[PDB]
Amino acid sequence: FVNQHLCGSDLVEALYLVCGERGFFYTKPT
Amino acid sequence: GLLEQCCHSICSLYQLENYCN
């Protein structure tokens, strides 16, 4: 990507694509 | 420093690819 603020489940979204089936390890829901 | 740089600022999927297992 370029310049984008990722936050909340949006993080696993960025990971979803880079890894996705690789099961990322972002944080949890607070 | 996982979503703080993306929530409190901007980040690139590059360093974000490190949060994957």
Swiss-Prot record, chain A:
Q: So where does this one cross the membrane? A: none
Q: What is the effect of changing R22Q?
A: In MODY10; reduces binding affinity to INSR; reduces biological activity; reduces folding properties
Q: What is this protein called?
A: Insulin B chain
Origin species, per record, is Homo sapiens (Human)
- High-level lineage: Eukaryota, Metazoa, Chordata, Craniata, Vertebrata
